């Protein structure tokens, strides 16, 4: 069986907080 | 062959062949909360200055 990983799999690449930004 | 082989450590061996004990301390620098710190003390906190 197969399925579509729509948009999942994104994880915080760093343990540093950020806000309102496109990194 | 057996992948391991024994060192020959005799007291009369040359210093190059004498046994040395090695310890490697590995630490990752500041990216998250910490639990190993130095002997530095602390102080109160003041705001608006």
Swiss-Prot record, chain B:
Record's subunit section: Binds to host ACE2. RBD also interacts with the N-linked glycan on 'Asn-90' of ACE2. Cleavage of S generates a polybasic C-terminal sequence on S1 that binds to host Neuropilin-1 (NRP1) and Neuropilin-2 (NRP2) receptors. Interacts with host integrin alpha-5/beta-1 (ITGA5:ITGB1) and with ACE2 in complex with integrin alpha-5/beta-1 (ITGA5:ITGB1). May interact via cytoplasmic c-terminus with M protein. May interact (via N-terminus) with host bilirubin and biliverdin, thereby preventing antibody binding to the SARS-CoV-2 spike NTD via an allosteric mechanism.
Region described as Disordered: spans on this chain: 31-49
Outcome when changing residue 13 to T: Reduced host ACE2-binding affinity in vitro
Effect of residue 5 to R: In strain: Omicron/BA.1, Omicron/BA.2, Omicron/BA.2.12.1
The encoding gene: S
Task performed by this protein: Attaches the virion to the cell membrane by interacting with host receptor, initiating the infection. The major receptor is host ACE2. When S2/S2' has been cleaved, binding to the receptor triggers direct fusion at the cell membrane. When S2/S2' has not been cleaved, binding to the receptor results in internalization of the virus by endocytosis using host TFRC and GRM2 and leading to fusion of the virion membrane with the host endosomal membrane. Alternatively, may use NRP1/NRP2 and integrin as entry receptors.
Protein name: Spike protein S1
Species in which this protein is naturally found: Severe acute respiratory syndrome coronavirus 2
């Amino acid at each position: 069986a197969y399925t579509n990983s729509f948009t999942r799999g994104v994880y915080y690449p760093d343990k540093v907080f950020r806000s309102s930004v496109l990194h | 062959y057996f992948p391991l082989q024994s060192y020959g450590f005799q007291p009369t061996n040359g210093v190059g062949y004498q046994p040395y004990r090695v310890v490697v301390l590995s630490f990752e620098l500041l990216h998250a909360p910490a639990t190993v710190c130095g002997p530095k003390k602390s102080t109160n906190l003041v705001k608006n200055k």
